[PDB]
Amino acid sequence: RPIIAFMSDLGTTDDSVAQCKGLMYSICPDVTVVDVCHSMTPWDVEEGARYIVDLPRFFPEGTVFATTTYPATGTTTRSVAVRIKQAAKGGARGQWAGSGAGFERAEGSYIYIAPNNGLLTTVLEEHGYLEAYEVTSPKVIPEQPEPTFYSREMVAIPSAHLAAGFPLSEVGRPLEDHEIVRFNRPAVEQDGEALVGVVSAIDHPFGNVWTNIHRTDLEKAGIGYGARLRLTLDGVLPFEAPLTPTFADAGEIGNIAIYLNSRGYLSIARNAASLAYPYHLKEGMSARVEA
Amino acid sequence: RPIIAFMSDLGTTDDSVAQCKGLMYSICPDVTVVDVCHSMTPWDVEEGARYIVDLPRFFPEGTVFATTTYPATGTTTRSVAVRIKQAAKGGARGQWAGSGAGFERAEGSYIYIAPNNGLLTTVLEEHGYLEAYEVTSPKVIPEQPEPTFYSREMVAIPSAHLAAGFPLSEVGRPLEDHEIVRFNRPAVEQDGEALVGVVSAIDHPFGNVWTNIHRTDLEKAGIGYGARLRLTLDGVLPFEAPLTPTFADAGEIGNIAIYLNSRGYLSIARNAASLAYPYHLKEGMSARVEA
Amino acid sequence: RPIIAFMSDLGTTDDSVAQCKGLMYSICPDVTVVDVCHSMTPWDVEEGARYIVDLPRFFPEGTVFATTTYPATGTTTRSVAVRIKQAAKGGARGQWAGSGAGFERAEGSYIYIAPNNGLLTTVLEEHGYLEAYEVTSPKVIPEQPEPTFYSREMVAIPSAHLAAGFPLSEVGRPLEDHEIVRFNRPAVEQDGEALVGVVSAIDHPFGNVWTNIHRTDLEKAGIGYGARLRLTLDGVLPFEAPLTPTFADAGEIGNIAIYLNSRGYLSIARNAASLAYPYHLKEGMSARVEA
Amino acid sequence: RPIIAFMSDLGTTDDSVAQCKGLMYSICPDVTVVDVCHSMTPWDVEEGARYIVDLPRFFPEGTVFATTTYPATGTTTRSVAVRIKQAAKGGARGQWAGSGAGFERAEGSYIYIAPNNGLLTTVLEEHGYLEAYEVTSPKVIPEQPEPTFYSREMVAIPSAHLAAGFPLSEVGRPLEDHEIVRFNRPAVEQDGEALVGVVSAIDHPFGNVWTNIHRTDLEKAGIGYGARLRLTLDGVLPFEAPLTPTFADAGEIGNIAIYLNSRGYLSIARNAASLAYPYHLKEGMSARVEA
Amino acid sequence: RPIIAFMSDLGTTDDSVAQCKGLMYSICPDVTVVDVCHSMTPWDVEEGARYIVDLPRFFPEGTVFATTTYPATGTTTRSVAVRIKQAAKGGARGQWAGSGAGFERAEGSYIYIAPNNGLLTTVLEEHGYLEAYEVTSPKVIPEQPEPTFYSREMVAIPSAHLAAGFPLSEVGRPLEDHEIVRFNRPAVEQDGEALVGVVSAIDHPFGNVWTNIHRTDLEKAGIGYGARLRLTLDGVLPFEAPLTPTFADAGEIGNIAIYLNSRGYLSIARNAASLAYPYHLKEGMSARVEA
Amino acid sequence: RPIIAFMSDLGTTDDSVAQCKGLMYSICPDVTVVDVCHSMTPWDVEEGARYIVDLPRFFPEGTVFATTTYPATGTTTRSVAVRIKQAAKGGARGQWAGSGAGFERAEGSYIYIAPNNGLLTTVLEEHGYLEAYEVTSPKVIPEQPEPTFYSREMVAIPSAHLAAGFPLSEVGRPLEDHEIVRFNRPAVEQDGEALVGVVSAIDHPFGNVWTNIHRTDLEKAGIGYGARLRLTLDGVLPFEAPLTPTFADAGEIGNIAIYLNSRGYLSIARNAASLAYPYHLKEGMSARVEA
Ligand SMILES: Nc1ncnc2c1ncn2[C@@H]1O[C@H](CF)[C@@H](O)[C@H]1O
Ligand SMILES: Nc1ncnc2c1ncn2[C@@H]1O[C@H](CF)[C@@H](O)[C@H]1O
Ligand SMILES: Nc1ncnc2c1ncn2[C@@H]1O[C@H](CF)[C@@H](O)[C@H]1O
Ligand SMILES: Nc1ncnc2c1ncn2[C@@H]1O[C@H](CF)[C@@H](O)[C@H]1O
Ligand SMILES: Nc1ncnc2c1ncn2[C@@H]1O[C@H](CF)[C@@H](O)[C@H]1O
Ligand SMILES: Nc1ncnc2c1ncn2[C@@H]1O[C@H](CF)[C@@H](O)[C@H]1O
Ligand code: MET
Ligand code: MET
Ligand code: MET
Ligand code: MET
Ligand code: MET
Ligand code: MET
Structure with a gap:
């Protein structure tokens, strides 16, 4: 019963998010798609980061985060998928979320897929990562990507394949640390x-x-x-x-x-x-x- | 197939609702979470109430309503959980909701969990109740609750335990009628x-x-x-x-x-x-x- | 695993959408309700048509589209429900949606249910239709419909019965092509x-x-x-x-x-x-x- | 423009081939169905194989080969679907097929779907393969399959889903090499x-x-x-x-x-x-x- | 993208079927012509019937069946075109054809055109019909029919006009039930x-x-x-x-x-x-x- | 919407015709391949001529006729490709084919490509020709043609290039009338x-x-x-x-x-x-x- 939590800059005023959602159920029919939020200031990767970095401890292990603002839509740029290391405690004390002492979460248990534009900077800084890959396989992206809609083509679509069990390692070649873009905080x-x-x-x-x-x-x-x-x-x-x-x-x-x-x-x-x-x-x- | 219908003042501009959702699917993996609205004027309990008072007759029997604006977050106050009596007819004419003659709802069939700040005033007035409890048990709320996020700690989380089948009388001690806070209409x-x-x-x-x-x-x-x-x-x-x-x-x-x-x-x-x-x-x- | 994609003018500021959803789960317990959008300009049928015309090729076969702005609510007007023909390629190029070469969709695979006020104009142009029916039967709409809420009574409720397997031809008599209202483009x-x-x-x-x-x-x-x-x-x-x-x-x-x-x-x-x-x-x- | 090349033992004297064709155009409306032959001696898997083993290099990349004689029709056996590795040169001299130097075919470019009765023995020997799956998913084969017509139910139908873009790894679980049946040459x-x-x-x-x-x-x-x-x-x-x-x-x-x-x-x-x-x-x- | 499925007694040994096919693409250029079979015993209308009666559930709605053995070729006899009612379930259980629970097919969705010699007897018995017409208009048949080739002149040709959208009602006057020839089974x-x-x-x-x-x-x-x-x-x-x-x-x-x-x-x-x-x-x- | 009408002596008992067709779609993806027949007596050129002489008036303008029995396969013999003149009336009367007064065909509207062994004798008598050419160019035949399969190498492949717009005059040098072989009638x-x-x-x-x-x-x-x-x-x-x-x-x-x-x-x-x-x-x- 896999979950994709979806954060975009597509807004909630037209059918863009639905278009992605439809493709997520087309590919992983038993998926639950949880909206994070779609209101963020377009192209502001530092803000988008804020809305995704604290998420992992709150979700069941195996959850896939699909997080995108994609100003380089239509270019030779390709997204990045990473498995994170620490789920990480959080809050004002530093603790697991939930009732009791909280849901303790395993390592290597969540995947992020995002443009390689620095959106995942804090994610990697605060959780770490075990492996990263460029998203290029035509089994998980379109052969003919819609030039102006890479948030659907290079994020939503492949996120559902991963959610359906598609092996992370087979989305494309491994990426070295320096090839993953950061902004400096x-x-x-x-x-x-x-x-x-x-x-x-x-x-x-x-x-x-x-x-x-x-x-x-x-x-x-x-x-x-x-x-x-x-x-x-x-x-x-x-x-x-x-x-x-x-x-x-x-x-x-x-x-x-x-x-x-x-x-x-x-x-x-x-x-x-x-x-x-x-x-x-x-x-x-x-x-x-x-x- | 349990449902939790979720009304808050948390907004849809950041990931706050999604943190609660992640925890609700964590505790009760079969749940469906239905958004009511997250836009209400903060701290305005009379406004919150209009959004939740008419809901019961529309939802399947068993549904749990997590309804929250929590200005007293971080204090010693504790939430209230109530099994309402009558689902009650509504509308301009007074009727059950749905196709045909409408779907008739058995008594004692819905639970609301909210801050004890008066939010449920019109719910109780219009639907009555069979039982009320203060929500204190570390099986349904966190041992160390996040001071500024009681809408997650003391509503979202235990709403999920109740959806999962945690017995209502086990959440905390019985509340007498005068211990339930009310606004004056x-x-x-x-x-x-x-x-x-x-x-x-x-x-x-x-x-x-x-x-x-x-x-x-x-x-x-x-x-x-x-x-x-x-x-x-x-x-x-x-x-x-x-x-x-x-x-x-x-x-x-x-x-x-x-x-x-x-x-x-x-x-x-x-x-x-x-x-x-x-x-x-x-x-x-x-x-x-x-x- | 039935799907209802829900587009309305109800907004997200109160419990109107959620009342619709409650009755959708009531009628078709195993449904997934995907929001398209709810923010459209009230009564602006051309704008509503842009948010729904391109959806079909993105959604699993069998999906129902509940699409509604209902300025004539409370009148003797009755909704229309159509099975469309070609799911239709789209985008800047003219392709199927999805990974690889996209996913092709069998014809006659999607129903739209909407007010007969021209909201479906462009859906019919772009997709054709195999059948069209007045929505009058008491099995799928209320006997006493709420005068001011036909988006719920004559769109939301009926769409759920249809998602649950209710036979399309049994909602009411067939309509001829001239009785389906169009806005001229x-x-x-x-x-x-x-x-x-x-x-x-x-x-x-x-x-x-x-x-x-x-x-x-x-x-x-x-x-x-x-x-x-x-x-x-x-x-x-x-x-x-x-x-x-x-x-x-x-x-x-x-x-x-x-x-x-x-x-x-x-x-x-x-x-x-x-x-x-x-x-x-x-x-x-x-x-x-x-x- | 997908193609399915169709080899069976169904004959051309009644409408059996046409039933499968009608279903293949139903599932994948853009498909072109190319007949191989339908005359093979029934149940003779070595004969079927000579008709299908040399085909790949002649066809466009993407082509799907529905190849079937099904003596075990109606039993618990299930079909196999394989992405072959090399299109392989052929002829009396060994060459790519076509005008000029011939049309060179990329690896991993064709899929065969057949009974798991050994029909693909020479295909696998001569072309290799990258992946194999048992065809069990009710998205690509019928819930209630016609007992005496598995060549339609378990080859023709899912061959059309594959032509349409249904992901190969989603048809059923992976088959290991020893689970694929073979005839001895x-x-x-x-x-x-x-x-x-x-x-x-x-x-x-x-x-x-x-x-x-x-x-x-x-x-x-x-x-x-x-x-x-x-x-x-x-x-x-x-x-x-x-x-x-x-x-x-x-x-x-x-x-x-x-x-x-x-x-x-x-x-x-x-x-x-x-x-x-x-x-x-x-x-x-x-x-x-x-x- | 209309389909004509073609059943004749013309054999596959000379160019007779091709001659009809050429005329079908001349008249409806975007047509797909699916061979049912052309081997039937000449003039045996009971056998021809067997090869056509089970077809409808297998094809996309709008398909035109062109079915002919024409021993009265060269006479004042004129063909008949009928819209059928039930697509009809079939097989050993009684079910829709296809993957899943099958492609459910609308009523009034297929047209047969045949000599009025009893060939459609079982078609009408097992499906019913909504309307029947004699095929006499020179817009869909030749002014000077080739005396010995009415299977091309009074079936193939008009079948393509219907496939191209020519209105069924305009092929000639309505026929009463008794005017449609039957054989008795x-x-x-x-x-x-x-x-x-x-x-x-x-x-x-x-x-x-x-x-x-x-x-x-x-x-x-x-x-x-x-x-x-x-x-x-x-x-x-x-x-x-x-x-x-x-x-x-x-x-x-x-x-x-x-x-x-x-x-x-x-x-x-x-x-x-x-x-x-x-x-x-x-x-x-x-x-x-x-x- | 190009058409190739394919007449051979290859039979329908193996994959020979389909190899030809695979390469026809490879070369001209948007082609429609119509079978004339494939059952002729091998090497009987008079019989082959009866199945192809009357075809043109039935086919859309621009149609290519791949017509072949090739007993000289593997020799230095090269095919001939002609554009015919009059499409020629036919039948018992002497009319155009089609509904109404038939469809007239512009002159110079059809190409035949065939072995230079007299197969085209009657086509040339009945239709005349405007141009005739040896088929030698490597752009339209293989550099190393399969010795025993010239019906595929020097007829099937070339016909596809011609259907795809390849200029007729560029296949090889012109032939004079005496170099086109005839069987005497x-x-x-x-x-x-x-x-x-x-x-x-x-x-x-x-x-x-x-x-x-x-x-x-x-x-x-x-x-x-x-x-x-x-x-x-x-x-x-x-x-x-x-x-x-x-x-x-x-x-x-x-x-x-x-x-x-x-x-x-x-x-x-x-x-x-x-x-x-x-x-x-x-x-x-x-x-x-x-x-
Ligand atoms: N005007 C725009 N300039 C650059 N990028 C844009 C613009 N408008 C939208 N986008 C991006 O398109 C992506 C589609 F996937 C969205 O994520 C936007 O960031
Ligand atoms: N500034 C605030 N003062 C008092 N209460 C607040 C304030 N901001 C947010 N809240 C409440 O905190 C709860 C956390 F769950 C939210 O529901 C707000 O009502
Ligand atoms: N003021 C209004 N006039 C006409 N229609 C209205 C008005 N306000 C809301 N509505 C419509 O009522 C429907 C109830 F289902 C909604 O879809 C509104 O379009
Ligand atoms: N008599 C038969 N015994 C075993 N298998 C059979 C028999 N007749 C036909 N078949 C197989 O049924 C499949 C149905 F799809 C065909 O491909 C035949 O191989
Ligand atoms: N010998 C024949 N007697 C009567 N009908 C015939 C004979 N040979 C062929 N036909 C019919 O001609 C029709 C041409 F359209 C075919 O459908 C044959 O049934
Ligand atoms: N035995 C044969 N002798 C001469 N030609 C032959 C023989 N068998 C088949 N063929 C021809 O090979 C061509 C291959 F394209 C076919 O068209 C046959 O006519
Ligand atoms: C332009 S970014 C993609 C979203 C936009 N609303 C679209 O549908 O094209
Ligand atoms: C302070 S009210 C709780 C929601 C707030 N946006 C937060 O993230 O903590
Ligand atoms: C007035 S149109 C229906 C929606 C409105 N918000 C209501 O609750 O009735
Ligand atoms: C029994 S094998 C399937 C083909 C057979 N002719 C049928 O119609 O059922
Ligand atoms: C005599 S029935 C029509 C078919 C026949 N072979 C012909 O071409 O005339
Ligand atoms: C021998 S002539 C060409 C056709 C033959 N069946 C082959 O495959 O080679």
């Missing part, structure tokens, strides 16, 4: 004991504000759950609050909460109100934090 | 022959206008299909038309129709044009009807 | 040797621009892939470029590609950048093209 | 300088006589075009003539020609008269050659 | 619980023996698949065997098998050997069966 | 006012008897349709009857018709009964006829 800067980063994203639809300053960064400045923090956004907004587990820890509705979000990252928001929407806060603004 | 006031109420919702994406004046409120004042009616929104804009069953009864395209919506409530629209969107009509505006 | 004219049409659509979320000028109109206007073309939109904005297979053929990010889309029609875009949103381009604007 | 014996063999076939409708002594058997004993040869059929009738490439080399009409047939095998005939038919020569009779 | 006699019929045919090239005692006759004597039967042929040959699905159920090669043939009729044969050819069994000999 | 003599010829053919499968005495020989012997005729065959068997248009003109089943066949020549038959097989009549027997 900027580091969290240091010193003064302060940490300098950015707003990775606005957490829709709440308007929470997410930074790229991970828990591991907070640790190794000695920052923990009682610490009176000062987090400055956009160079001019020095918010001040203790680091708390959650939103209601700020007291009244509307108050400020500095917390670790559900993916392990330092964040700021308001208790049952929007921080970012009234003040038009945006991804890309700076983010410093300190004692 | 603003009453429809009498004021001469005029019934005063409120625009409960704009009916997206058409721009139809729904009030909280029920058909039982109408057939209390002797108003039935065919009476001429004045209807005053925001105190200032009145509207005259007969009460008809549907939009095409208004004559030309654009003409005003006053009707009973598919949930039994008095409503007003234009025939195949939007009424709300040109005039920026909004929920919360008053609504006065009179014959 | 405005032709691409010639003003000299320049071709004159409309922007059929803004291809969200990318902001590409699609025209109603087909590949067949370019052939025997004497226009193939080398040709240098002047495209003018709204009778104001001119753009120049050769006709290419795809976006990256235009060179640098931001440059103009004029190309043929995955449905066969002349289109225009920027390479990995939006063209429609900065210049606020829209559906319905004239589109002229010369060599 | 009687060897050409050495006996001094004399090579002993057998008349493999009468070459209808000319009455030429074919042996199972190959050219590699000849050019093993140093015999080439021009040597004087004695050839003894049925132990008693000898024949003296030089080995020439063709019939006209024998001189007058009626004279004896010993030659290499178009399949590389040593043969004997008369120049523009029948040799077999006057003397009632027959397959199975011995054949001894010597220089 | 002898009933299967009854009583003693024994059933008395004949050998309908010898199943070439195997030498199986077919009777006119259908499955429906066997049913309603209570005869099924375990029954120890006694079938006497030619008044003197009381064969004795159980009724089995197929040939291999008799055990050793050469043993007797009483089975239901692939058209639903009681038959007798040997397991991988000829019953009829060694003993010169013939169509027309008697056939009784019993406990 | 034995004349119908007069012994007084009685006419003396041969049975040209037994018209299988009916057993009618065809003579080499044409309609033109009957005209100005003073013999039209009323005339009472004494036909004598083999110089022994006498038959008497008037000349009639067709078979049923003879009255009762079994009676003698003397008539004119669909190719224009005096013939004799029984009405709906065989004449040749009971009396074992044969090709080559004398045929005398007087009034």
